[PDB]
């Protein structure tokens, strides 16, 4: 009797943590699909979930005209001639209509009063826009290839990126800070930062295929007060209790959230052309251990239950540091806060059988109108059995 699997409300809530089920692509590097343009197959970002805080860190030389910023226009041929190697500018698509109107960045205000845009949230509106942008081939015919997007929720600007690459390394192909000098490309990689670019949301154009779906299907926010776990031997085991978990000492919870995205086991599609389908060390939580040390628990096991812990915060590679729903994803009319509620009156303390190997048992209850789930010592005689 896994309380987190006990009814329809709970199953759906929990399923929002399953990145294999709903996101289905690489996280760190999303290259999940292949698409033909002029008889060549190209890799295309494909994930269904938006990736909160992900930005692409550039390693251009620290001098004009370089700005080290992926949201700057891709470089013009002119600009490149005026700069030398490496290529300047960034990843932003710089195309215009004949009247000169930019495709990117595009103001959210123009998207919220346009009849073609059917999304309810601002983030969706931007995803949808991305979804409705396809490349044209050498015959000017629309293809099925779509560039990823970044919503800047601070500026209410939606970006389409002309560059789908997310990771370039190796001094054979790219330079760090202009070194070596003859190289075309600067190096770059995906990052999340403990302080910067939280307001940036990166996504494949396929999050806007069903633009409202990310709201109930993706783990958009950090989850305060619980630890991710898997139901096993009749109780909820949090990642601290599993063999394959990676635990690091951290200075703050933010570092842990960064780690869920940056650890070397995270779902990645980067080479050979692998497709993670979203499997990898994508889940983790910050917690304070019994001795008062702040720690991070990193795991590749999809949560199917939660252990209660008011000092803990569970994160995923997809989601934000932020623990509360922002306005740009609330409809103009999900159940993120409400699904975990109870009343003492009806939810009585139920103690599961004794896990004899650990000599603990599940206890489930209602404390402060929310479900609490922990492991307590077995009863006295029940301990005879350990």
């Amino acid at each position: 009797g896994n309380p987190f699997q006990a009814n329809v409300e709970m199953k759906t809530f929990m399923e929002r943590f399953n990145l294999t089920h709903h996101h289905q692509s690489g996280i760190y590097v999303d290259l999940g699909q292949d698409k033909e343009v002029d008889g060549t197959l190209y890799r295309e970002p494909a994930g269904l979930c938006p990736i909160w805080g992900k930005h692409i860190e550039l390693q251009q030389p620290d001098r004009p005209p370089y700005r080290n910023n992926f949201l700057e226009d891709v470089p013009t041929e002119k600009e490149y001639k005026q700069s030398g190697n490496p290529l300047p500018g960034g990843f932003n698509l710089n195309f215009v209509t004949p009247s000169g109107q930019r495709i990117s960045p595009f103001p959210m205000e123009l998207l919220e009063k346009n009849s073609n845009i059917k999304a309810s949230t601002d983030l969706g509106r931007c995803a949808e826009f991305a979804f409705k942008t396809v490349a044209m081939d050498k015959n000017n015919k629309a293809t099925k290839y779509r560039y990823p997007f970044v919503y800047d929720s601070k500026k209410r600007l939606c970006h389409i990126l002309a560059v789908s690459m997310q990771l370039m390394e190796g001094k054979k192909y790219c330079s760090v800070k202009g070194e070596p000098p003859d190289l075309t490309w600067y190096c770059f990689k995906p990052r999340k930062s403990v302080t910067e670019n939280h307001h940036l949301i990166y996504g494949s154009a396929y999050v806007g295929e069903n633009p409202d779906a990310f709201i109930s299907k993706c783990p958009n926010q950090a989850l305060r007060g619980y630890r991710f776990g898997v139901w096993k031997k009749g109780r909820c085991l949090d990642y601290t209790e599993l063999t394959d978990t990676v635990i690091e000492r951290v200075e703050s919870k933010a570092q842990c959230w960064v780690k869920t995205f940056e650890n070397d086991g995270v779902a990645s599609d980067q080479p050979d052309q692998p497709h993670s389908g979203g499997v990898g060390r994508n889940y983790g939580f910050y917690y304070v251990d019994t001795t008062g040390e702040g720690k991070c628990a990193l795991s590749d096991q999809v949560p199917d239950c939660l252990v209660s812990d008011s000092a803990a915060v569970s994160y995923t590679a997809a989601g934000s540091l932020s623990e509360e729903t922002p306005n740009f994803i609330i409809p103009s009319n999900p159940t993120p806060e409400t699904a975990l509620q109870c009343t003492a009156d009806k939810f009585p303390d139920s103690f599961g059988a004794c896990d004899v190997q650990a000599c603990k048992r599940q206890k489930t209850s209602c404390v402060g109108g929310q479900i609490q789930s922990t492991s307590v010592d077995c009863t006295a005689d029940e301990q005879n059995e350990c």
Binding site: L41, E77, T133, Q273
Partner: protein
């Protein structure tokens, strides 16, 4: 082959226009930077 390597890490189709449902056809106002 540099093209295979690029394709592998998500190198993009070499394209000058995109169609968007809200703005129609969208093209580069100047030549896009190419190579070395």
């Amino acid at each position: 082959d540099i093209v295979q390597h690029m394709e592998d890490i998500g190198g993009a189709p070499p394209v000058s226009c995109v169609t968007n449902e809200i703005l129609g056809v969208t093209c580069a106002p100047q030549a896009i930077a190419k190579a070395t």
